[PDB]
């Protein structure tokens, strides 16, 4: 039973990690707005190529960057998700 | 080695004996209990210190007492 | 990059005497200190 | 989906509306958690995918959902009394 | 006196913000509603009410009387708590309706457990409220 | 008979004891709303 | 006065019900060191982790208990 | 600024409290 | 048969690793030593102070030789409050050409350090000018080391060596160190303070060549046996005095305006010196009051067992026995004494922290905010770990030294008595303030989200507003005790008063800040912390002998695993448990107080002081406005397009993460998945090619439990105080620097 109590932390890490692999090079890479010329202008600005090798850049560019949104977030719509 | 100490409160009912796994415990005879037999712990060198003589007893506090004391290569339990 | 303060030489020569040096020395003498029987 | 939701205003602009299926009692200050999503409607956004399954079940209004939804109640009393 | 703490009506800060205080319920007029029921309130700098605890009157409203409702309330639920528990005591099956609460008892504990203060003041006058330091279980020291 | 027994246990008791006291602090702050303190 | 049913209180300092009122289950007559079987309404902590059930009755001595 | 004498000043300097803190470890261990 | 460690003999037959990390960890625990009686005990324990002390004398050593020698004492001097010190330089064969580039700076060539213990105003306000000023107290700091390592190194020889006696006189003890220790220092401190820091504040050189020419006061030693003291207060130091040279500079040695001065914003130094010269006086008074030798004085003994309320007392017997058995309780047991000193040490600590941030003593050092920051975060942290460590020996004097015998009925075992009373009260009061500071910061956090921030709980804390106004505050109104003009305290011959009212009135100080309702929840927050961090010392201290779980806990010890699985459960039961999970809650609530401070003070540094004003109420506004703010700085200290100066603090930031995450590997995950981890590990060791000719000495086994508890209590320790050491430095170091 220990070995899945200690499993659960470790699939938290896993996942946690997939998913934040998943949100961050979405948004660098692949999602965003097009633009008229054809260029596609992404939602962070491509960031992952530079950012996405160091703890720095996942703590900066990635955790406290995009946090911006859920801690302003207060009297607005997505308040609760704060 | 752990110590062993079996108290006079012991009411004989040799639950220490089989929930010790490694022979530790045996039962003596003894003329102050109702069913005649005590608990000793002869080869106290082999025990390893899991406590499972001190979860089986049914005294308020544990007639059976086990102190972690030194440890061997017996007490760790060390196949290796 | 020595420094403006007198004796520049001497961070040159501690510092890795205190990092490396001393250090596996220590390491070195306190490991036969605490494995040597008897 | 048939009732609290905007799918029918969905279906005709998808581009422009947010999927919401979940309004907000105002009790307290909570109805500032009804989103401002388009087409006059207040709710949360929803992000289940719902509305683009919904979209391509072929389903075009709120009264199939609804029928859905008894279906599933039925469906549900037949499980259990299974 | 508080001269730091101006009245809200006063405050030329709670002002601007009473104009956009947001409808809390489906009434239209709420904001307006608690707009002028804070402005009875001591505002700071911010423009929000502040709420003085010391005992004294005129600002009692902020901590006497929800104080005093409380402790009634409390003491309601506690004495009636305390009243279930003595009284499932000495029937000799405690624990099964411990686990399974026995509802007609706690309705009759529940509906007369208004008088819980005349009550507690009897039980501490006749000496049946607190129970002696022999008669009670102590650790080891 | 049994299911009164059923009904007279802690969870479900508790679970009824807390949606009515949930319900009547919401019905409260439904028709008086916003006392921050008594005026 | 130690008899069978009569409510006793322990004196043993150690053990989980000092200074608690339990039953006489039976007092044994022969020279055993702790005769007087005790058992009491609540229960020991004895047993394993997670275990709902745990022991309600121990042997003590004469001068370990009083009649009250 | 000092000279750079003096920091060879304090470097042997300190070698009296360099041995005898050797002085007082070792009679502390035993 | 291994020779360590040599101490334990238990530990000496262990074939594992366990021998060496218990050998580690039982070095200091003398009275457990195999062969050690008392009288050898105490005489280690002489010893080792004497090492301490060289310890701490090298240290200081070494901060004013860095000072001194690649420091920059020269340039500071002529402006302390735009040149940043220099703590020591750096050489790093690490450093690529952008870090050497943003490290050299504060003036400097070279990558140096910017200090922040703020030595550099401790320096320039006693005295210190140059650097052969500090490098000749370098060196007579390494003389002074020498000579503790001498006199540590001559108690240990056996015609040196002190008695049993001797160690256990208290009476000589407290006379010489009340008289001698904490008088005859004090005032040789205000021989230093009238001799060389008060001219040197004035422009007057003394040096230790023209200490015996220049003469502090026009009139020397004349009005000092004469009586008329007055006249060493006869010319103060005038408000538009510059620091550090003669214009503007008064002639009085001894004044006493109880203010700030106005250019460095700290304490005037002659009232330094005057404050030094009566606790002086107090210090050596106090210190003649217990009899050694010549038959008058008073014997502690006697002034214990006379300390008992008789019959006839409104109070009665309430104490039972009153305090006899002490004086052979607290000589006897060292872990009693010890749990003393760290108990006063903690709280002046703590003192020492609340004092040097509202009261500067050194000159320009609260325009140095970074400074002021570190400090009180040092001091408040280990403050925090003294108060801990006394109610730890607190638990180790009851669960190894404490006899029922000796103390019978006294206070300390009617304290035993009613053991769980406390616990039970102090419990209640933990959660009276939990719930609570808790439903009032969740509230606040939900009406402000819903839109409405006015339908806060907002709370005046109008009994700190009237303790301020009590101290002479006239901003809220009170006009009570010193700030109305008229009253029997203000009308007094108190003059202090126009100094000290015109320094708490004006906003340009730390000295009693502004406080509203986010210092009202933030207060309840820290006593919920300390009621809670005592909870648990309590809580494990008077459970130490035992209880109704485990009545022989005493038995064991203080520091053992479990009991088993067996009786329920039994993890966390030793009194080691308080100390284990009471540096969590302690560290918990020094975080809560040092946000706090560190928050309030960036809103009155920067000049925008309505940020905490109206968001520290909810704990968004503290997750938001203080966190994510100012980690802005500090995480960009290294980024893709270049380093900064905080790029050490960016990496002190995330290696405190570090630590403090692996810590949580150590207090979640528990032993036997480690060894069973370490047995396959062994297995592919020995069952390898060409690695099983490297054998082991000693068998590999996991940590131990307790092991294992305490390694993860460091990690998260040392993790706590790196990130926010880091966090702190770079928060207010990137603005203000
Ligand atoms: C404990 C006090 C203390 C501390 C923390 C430091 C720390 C530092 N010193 Mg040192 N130093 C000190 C005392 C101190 N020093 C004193 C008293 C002197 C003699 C006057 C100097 C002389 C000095 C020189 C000349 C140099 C440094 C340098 C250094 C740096 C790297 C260490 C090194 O290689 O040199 C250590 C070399 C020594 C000769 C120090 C000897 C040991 C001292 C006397 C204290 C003993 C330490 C401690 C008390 C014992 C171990 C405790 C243990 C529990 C950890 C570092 C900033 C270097 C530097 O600036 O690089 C940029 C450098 O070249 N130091
Ligand atoms: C805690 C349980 C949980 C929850 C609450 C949901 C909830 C969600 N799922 Mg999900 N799901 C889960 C577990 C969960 N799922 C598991 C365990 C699987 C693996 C089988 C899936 C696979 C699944 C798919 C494939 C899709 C959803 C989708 C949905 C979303 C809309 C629900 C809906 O009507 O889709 C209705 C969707 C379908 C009916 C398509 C599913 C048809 C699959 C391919 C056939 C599975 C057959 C059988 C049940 C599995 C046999 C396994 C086989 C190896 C033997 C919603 C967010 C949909 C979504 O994201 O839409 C935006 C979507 O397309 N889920
Ligand atoms: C009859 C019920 C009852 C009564 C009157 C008490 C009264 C007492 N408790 Mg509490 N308590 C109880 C139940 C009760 N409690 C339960 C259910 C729990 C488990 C959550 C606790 C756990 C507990 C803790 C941890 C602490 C107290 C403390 C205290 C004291 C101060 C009050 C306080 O802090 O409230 C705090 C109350 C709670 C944390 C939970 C109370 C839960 C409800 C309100 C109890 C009443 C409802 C009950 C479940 C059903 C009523 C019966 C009904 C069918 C008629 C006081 C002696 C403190 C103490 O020792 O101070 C001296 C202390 O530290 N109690
Ligand atoms: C534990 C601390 C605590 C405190 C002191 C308060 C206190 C308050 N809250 Mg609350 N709040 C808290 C935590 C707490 N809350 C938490 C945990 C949440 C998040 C879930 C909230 C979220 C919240 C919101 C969103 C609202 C409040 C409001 C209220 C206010 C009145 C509520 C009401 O209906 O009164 C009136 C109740 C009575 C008069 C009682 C009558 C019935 C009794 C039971 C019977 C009496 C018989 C005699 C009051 C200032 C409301 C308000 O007005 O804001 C200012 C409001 O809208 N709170
Ligand atoms: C007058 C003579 C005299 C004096 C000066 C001392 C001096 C001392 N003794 Mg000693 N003692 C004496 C005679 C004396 N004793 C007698 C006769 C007895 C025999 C009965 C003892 C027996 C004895 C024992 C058994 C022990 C001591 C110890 C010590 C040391 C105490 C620890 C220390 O250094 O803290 C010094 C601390 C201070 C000066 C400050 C104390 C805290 C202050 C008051 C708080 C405020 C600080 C203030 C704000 C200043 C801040 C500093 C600045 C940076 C701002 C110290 C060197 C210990 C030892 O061995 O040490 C080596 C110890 O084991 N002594
Ligand atoms: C224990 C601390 C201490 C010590 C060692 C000294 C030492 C001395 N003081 Mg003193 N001083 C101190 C405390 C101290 N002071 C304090 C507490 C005050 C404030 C009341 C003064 C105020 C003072 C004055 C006003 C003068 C001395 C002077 C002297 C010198 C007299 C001896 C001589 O040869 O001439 C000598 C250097 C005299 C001096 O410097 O003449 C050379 C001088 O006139 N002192
Ligand atoms: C004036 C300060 C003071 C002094 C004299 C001591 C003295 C003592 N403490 Mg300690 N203690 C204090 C403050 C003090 N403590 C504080 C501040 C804390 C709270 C953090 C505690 C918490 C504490 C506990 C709860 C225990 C003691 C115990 C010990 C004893 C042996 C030390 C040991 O385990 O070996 C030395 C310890 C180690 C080598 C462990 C590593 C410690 C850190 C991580 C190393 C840092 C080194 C660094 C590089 C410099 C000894 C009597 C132990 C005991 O029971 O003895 C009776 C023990 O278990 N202490
Ligand atoms: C945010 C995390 C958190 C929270 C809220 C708790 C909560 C509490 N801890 Mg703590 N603690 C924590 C982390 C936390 N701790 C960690 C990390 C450790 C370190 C190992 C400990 C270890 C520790 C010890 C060892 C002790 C406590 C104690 C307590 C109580 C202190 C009384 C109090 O604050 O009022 C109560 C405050 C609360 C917030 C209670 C929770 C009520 C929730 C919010 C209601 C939710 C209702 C919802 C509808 C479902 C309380 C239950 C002490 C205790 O229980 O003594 C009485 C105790 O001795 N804790
Ligand atoms: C037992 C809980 C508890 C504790 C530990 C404290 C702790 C603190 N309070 Mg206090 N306080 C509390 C409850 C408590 N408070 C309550 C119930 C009120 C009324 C709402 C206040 C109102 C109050 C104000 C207005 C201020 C403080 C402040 C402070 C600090 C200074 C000490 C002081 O003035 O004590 C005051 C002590 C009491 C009022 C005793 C309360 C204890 C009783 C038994 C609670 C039950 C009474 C019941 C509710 C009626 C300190 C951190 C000051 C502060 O925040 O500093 C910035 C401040 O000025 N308190
Ligand atoms: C177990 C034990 C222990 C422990 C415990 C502890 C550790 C404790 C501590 C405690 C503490 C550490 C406490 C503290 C306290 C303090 C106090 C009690 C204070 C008071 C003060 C006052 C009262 C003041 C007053 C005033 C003035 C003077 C002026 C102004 C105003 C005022 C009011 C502020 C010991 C070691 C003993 C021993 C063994 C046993
Ligand atoms: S601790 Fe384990 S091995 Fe030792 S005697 Fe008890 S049951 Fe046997």
């Known amino acids: 039973w220990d070995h899945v109590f200690l499993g659960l932390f470790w699939m938290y890490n896993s996942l946690s990690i997939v998913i934040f692999h998943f949100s961050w090079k979405m948004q660098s890479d692949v999602w965003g707005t097009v633009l008229p010329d054809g260029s596609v202008s992404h939602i962070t600005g491509g960031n992952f190529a530079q950012s996405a090798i160091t703890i720095n850049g996942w703590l900066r560019d990635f955790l406290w960057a995009q946090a911006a949104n859920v801690i302003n977030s207060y009297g607005s719509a997505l308040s609760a998700y704060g | 080695s752990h110590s062993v100490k079996i108290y006079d409160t012991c009411i004989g009912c040799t639950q220490c004996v089989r929930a010790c796994p490694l022979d530790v415990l045996e039962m003596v005879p003894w003329d102050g209990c109702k069913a005649g037999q005590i608990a000793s712990s002869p080869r106290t060198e082999d025990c390893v210190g899991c406590k499972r003589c001190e979860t089986a007893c049914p005294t308020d506090f544990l007639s059976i007492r086990v102190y972690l004391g030194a440890e061997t290569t017996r007490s760790m339990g060390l196949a290796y | 990059i020595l420094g403006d303060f007198a004796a520049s030489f001497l961070p040159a020569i501690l510092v890795p005497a205190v990092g490396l040096v001393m250090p596996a020395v220590v390491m070195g003498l306190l490991f036969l200190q605490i494995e040597s029987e008897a | 989906g048939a009732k609290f939701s905007n799918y029918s205003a969905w279906l005709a602009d998808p581009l422009n509306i947010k999927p919401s299926a979940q309004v907000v009692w105002p009790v307290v200050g909570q109805d500032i958690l009804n989103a401002d999503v388009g087409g006059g409607f207040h709710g949360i956004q929803i992000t289940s995918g719902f509305f683009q399954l919904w979209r391509a079940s072929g389903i075009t209004n709120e009264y199939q959902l609804y029928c859905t939804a008894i279906g599933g109640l039925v469906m549900a009393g037949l499980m259990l009394f299974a | ?141 | 008979k049994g299911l009164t027994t059923f009904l007279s246990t802690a969870p479900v008791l508790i679970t009824a004891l807390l949606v009515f006291t949930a319900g009547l602090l919401i019905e409260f702050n439904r028709f008086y709303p916003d006392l921050l303190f008594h005026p | 006065a130690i008899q069978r049913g009569s409510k006793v209180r322990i004196l043993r300092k150690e053990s989980y019900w000092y200074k608690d009122v339990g039953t006489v289950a039976s007092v044994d007559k022969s020279g055993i060191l702790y005769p007087v079987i005790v058992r009491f309404d609540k229960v020991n902590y004895n047993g394993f982790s997670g275990s709902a059930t745990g022991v309600n009755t121990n042997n003590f001595a004469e001068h370990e208990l009083e009649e009250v | 600024s000092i000279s750079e004498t003096q920091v060879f000043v304090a470097l042997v300097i300190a070698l009296i409290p360099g041995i005898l803190a050797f002085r007082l470890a070792t009679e502390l261990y035993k | 048969a291994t020779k360590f460690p040599k101490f334990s003999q238990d530990l000496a037959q262990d074939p594992t690793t366990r021998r060496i990390w218990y050998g580690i960890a039982t070095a200091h625990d003398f009275e457990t030593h195999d062969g050690m009686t008392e009288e050898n005990l105490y005489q280690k324990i002489f010893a080792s102070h004497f090492g301490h002390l060289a310890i701490i004398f090298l240290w200081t050593s070494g901060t004013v030789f860095h000072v001194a020698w690649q420091g920059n004492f020269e340039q500071w001097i002529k402006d302390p409050l735009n040149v940043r010190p220099i703590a020591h330089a750096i050489w790093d064969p690490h450093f690529g050409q952008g870090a050497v580039d943003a490290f050299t700076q504060a003036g400097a060539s070279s990558p140096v350090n910017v200090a922040y213990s703020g030595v550099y105003h401790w320096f320039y306000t006693i005295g210190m000018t140059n650097n052969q000023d500090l490098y000749q107290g370098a060196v007579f700091l390494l003389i002074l080391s020498a000579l503790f390592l001498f006199a540590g190194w001559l108690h240990l020889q056996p015609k040196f060596r002190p008695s049993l006696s001797w160690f256990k006189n208290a009476e000589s003890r407290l006379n010489h160190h009340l008289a001698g220790l904490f008088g005859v220092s004090s005032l040789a401190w205000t021989g230093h303070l009238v001799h060389v820091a008060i001219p040197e504040s004035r422009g007057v050189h003394v040096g230790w060549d023209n200490f015996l020419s220049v003469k502090p006061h026009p009139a020397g030693l004349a009005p000092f046996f004469t009586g008329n003291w007055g006249v060493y207060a006869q010319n103060p130091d005038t408000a538009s005095h510059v620091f550090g040279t003669s214009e503007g500079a008064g002639s009085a040695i001894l004044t006493f305006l109880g203010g700030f001065h106005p250019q460095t914003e700290s304490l005037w130094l002659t009232d330094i010196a005057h404050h030094h010269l009566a606790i002086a006086v107090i210090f050596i008074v106090a210190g003649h009051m217990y009899r050694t030798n010549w038959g008058i004085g008073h014997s502690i003994k006697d002034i214990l067992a006379a300390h008992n309320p008789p019959q006839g007392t409104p109070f009665g017997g309430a104490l039972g026995a009153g305090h006899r058995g002490l004086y052979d309780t607290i000589n006897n047991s060292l872990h009693f004494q010890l749990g003393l000193a760290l108990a006063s040490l903690g709280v002046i600590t703590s003192l020492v922290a609340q004092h040097m941030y509202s009261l500067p003593s050194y000159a320009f050092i609260a325009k140095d905010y970074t400074t002021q920051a570190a400090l009180y975060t040092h001091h408040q942290y280990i403050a925090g770990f003294l108060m801990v460590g006394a109610f730890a020996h607190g638990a180790i004097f009851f669960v190894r030294d404490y006899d029922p015998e000796a103390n019978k009925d006294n206070v300390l075992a009617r304290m035993l008595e009613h053991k769980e009373a406390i616990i039970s009260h102090l419990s209640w009061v933990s959660l009276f303030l939990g719930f609570h500071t808790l439903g009032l910061y969740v509230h606040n956090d939900v009406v402000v989200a819903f839109g409405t921030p006015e339908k806060q709980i907002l709370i005046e804390p109008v009994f700190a507003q009237f303790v301020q106004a009590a101290s002479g505050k006239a901003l809220y109104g009170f006009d009570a005790l010193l700030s109305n003009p008229d009253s029997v305290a203000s009308t007094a011959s108190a003059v202090w008063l126009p100094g000290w009212l015109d320094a708490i009135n004006s906003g340009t100080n730390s000295l009693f800040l502004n406080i509203g309702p986010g210092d009202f929840l933030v207060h309840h927050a820290i006593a919920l912390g300390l009621h809670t961090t005592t909870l648990i010392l309590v809580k494990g201290a008077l459970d130490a002998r035992g209880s109704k779980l485990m009545p022989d806990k005493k038995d064991f010890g203080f520091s053992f695993p479990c009991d088993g699985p067996g009786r329920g459960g039994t993890c966390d039961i030793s009194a080691w448990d308080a100390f284990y999970l009471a540096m969590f809650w302690m560290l918990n609530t020094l975080g809560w107080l040092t946000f706090y401070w560190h928050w309030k003070h960036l809103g009155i540094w920067t000049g925008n002081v309505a940020q905490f004003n109206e968001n520290s109420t909810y704990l968004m506004g503290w997750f938001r406005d203080y966190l994510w703010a100012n980690s802005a700085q500090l995480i960009n200290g290294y980024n893709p397009y270049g380093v900064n100066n905080l790029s050490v603090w960016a990496w002190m930031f995330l290696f405190g993460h570090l630590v403090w995450a692996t810590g949580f590997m150590f207090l979640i995950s528990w032993r036997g998945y480690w060894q069973e981890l370490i047995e396959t590990i062994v297995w592919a060791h020995e069952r390898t090619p060409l690695a099983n000719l490297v054998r082991w000495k000693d068998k590999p086994v996991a940590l131990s439990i307790v092991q294992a508890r305490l390694v993860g209590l460091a990690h998260f320790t040392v993790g706590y105080i790196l990130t926010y050491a880091a966090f702190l430095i770079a928060s207010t170091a990137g603005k203000f620097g």
């Open chain 5, 1 to 141: 006196d508080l001269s730091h703490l101006t009245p809200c009506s006063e405050s030329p800060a709670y002002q601007a913000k009473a104009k956009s205080f947001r409808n809390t319920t489906s009434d239209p007029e709420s904001g307006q509603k608690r707009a002028e029921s804070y402005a009875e309130a001591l505002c700071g700098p911010e423009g929000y009410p502040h709420l003085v605890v010391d005992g004294r009157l005129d600002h009692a409203g902020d901590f006497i009387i929800p104080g005093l409702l409380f402790l009634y309330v409390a003491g309601w639920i506690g004495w009636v708590g305390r009243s279930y528990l003595i009284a499932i005591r000495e029937e000799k099956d405690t624990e099964m309706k411990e686990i399974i609460i026995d509802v007609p008892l706690a309705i009759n504990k529940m509906l007369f457990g208004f008088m819980w203060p005349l009550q507690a003041f009897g039980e501490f006058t006749s000496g049946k409220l607190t129970v002696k330091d022999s008669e009670i279980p102590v650790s080891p020291r």
